[PDB]
DNA sequence: CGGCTCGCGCA
DNA sequence: TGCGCGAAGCCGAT
């Protein structure tokens with residue numbers, strides 16, 4: 365609907381109806397940014413055609429109680445900066461608290477909304493909120509994929525078994541969907557405190573804070589400055605200083621050669637399409653560029669495909685049949701070690717390498733990409749059952765990772781424990797044919813002692 | 821039938 | 832360190 369630089373395949377209608385006379389309402393959930401936001405740009409285009417203002421609404425749910433302070437402050441501080449950024453474009457921002465199914469329905473009626481637009485997320489709870497809103501409103505409802513370069517329903521129509529079958533499909537659609545972002549035109553017609561929401565939330569999460577023996581907090585918040593502006597700086601420094609050596613040193617946890625974009629990419633503080641555009645134009649190592657593009661395009665967006673077409677993405681049923689049969693047969697195998705959630709959480713295992721991986725997660729909130737596999741696969745080896753291992757890994761991932769509660773997390777954990785998007789390997793006790801990682805294998809690929817000594 | 825995002829022996 | 836082989840089931844081009 366209207367616009368020359370807007371691909372209609374990025375927008376899909378969730379509910380048809382007569383368009384109202386009021387402003388266009390953008391229900392911002394996943395892409396918390398002002399620039400490079402297709403959902404915000406599309407909302408502005410519909411508003412321009414209808415000669416109505418565009419507004420953004422945010423619903424603060426009770427889900428932050430399941431998380432900790434580290435995600436709350438990171439997310440809330442970025443929204444404060446986003447509030448100023450949208451204010452400069454004469455776009456008002458309304459921050460609501462409560463159930464989005466009931467709050468969004470009330471906001472549309474009270475504000476006399478004409479059209480409702482929201483971003484795309486394949487998570488279960490997002491689909492539940494959308495259906496609740498659909499039953500309570502009478503205006504057109506649209507959904508825009510502002511997170512993936514190629515829209516999730518357009519890249520593939522089915523669950524993808526592996527990357528090698530999804531890679532040609534994604535790369536074929538890149539020329540159509542990889543394009544520059546038009547600038548966000550400000551509003552022409554003009555028409556809760558975030559500080560109070562922040563101060564209340566930390567008070568409710570203070571008891572659940574991760575502490576040391578001397579009651580000192582474990583989380584170090586100076587490693588990643590949140591916000592749209594800081595996310596851009598991280599991207600620029602990656603291309604200039606780190607992209608060249610990414611291809612060779614991405615699997616070395618002792619070297620800070622990763623992009624460190626996942627906390628911003630999870631909260632939508634930066635667009636992966638913007639990152640792809642800058643990386644494509646960069647003159648760097650061709651092997652490094654191909655390796656990084658495979659990470660942010662194929663593996664990031666296949667995680668959306670996994671969650672979109674598998675409602676049980678965080679369960680044992682989502683595993684492939686070969687993986688399920690292999691794990692089932694080894695249920696009665698005697699485990700070399702039985703560890704509980706608390707012992708995993710405190711880093712109280714016999715493995716100093718695994719403990720150091722947990723400490724990096726506890727202290728920085730972002731464990732290195734390579735050690736994340738060894739972290740999750742040892743949980744399977746040292747748990748009562750595959751279901752318990754899946755529960756433990758998801759719990760610690762979602763509680764302590766800044767990029768937690770993300771499709772990349774569920775696909776990554778399902779890859780590690782259930783062989784999702786993987787293949788079978790040598791038969792072993794307990795883990796069966798799931799891919800095996802050993803402490804000695806990590807020794808021959810990076811300096812394990814340096815990584816251990818860094819995080820005690 | 822070819823080829824998939826580990827460990828391991830060997831220079 | 833970097834390279835080639837081994838051990839496993841299966842998708843997808845035909």
Ligand SMILES: Cc1cc2nc3c(=O)[nH]c(=O)nc-3n(C[C@H](O)[C@H](O)[C@H](O)COP(=O)(O)OP(=O)(O)OC[C@H]3O[C@@H](n4cnc5c(N)ncnc54)[C@H](O)[C@@H]3O)c2cc1C
Nearest residue numbers: 622623624625626659660663664733736767768772773776
């Ligand atoms: C068990 C396990 C759990 C995971 N949990 C999370 C999580 O909670 N949140 C999360 O965002 N990612 C998760 N991943 C994926 C991966 O660990 C992170 O994306 C990455 O380590 C974050 O660091 P980075 O952005 O600097 O990595 P980079 O090497 O710089 O990667 C760049 C971007 O590519 C994407 N990406 C890279 N590797 C993967 C991957 N394996 N799967 C999917 N996308 C990928 C991410 O968007 C990332 O920001 C997990 C991986 C594993 C093995």
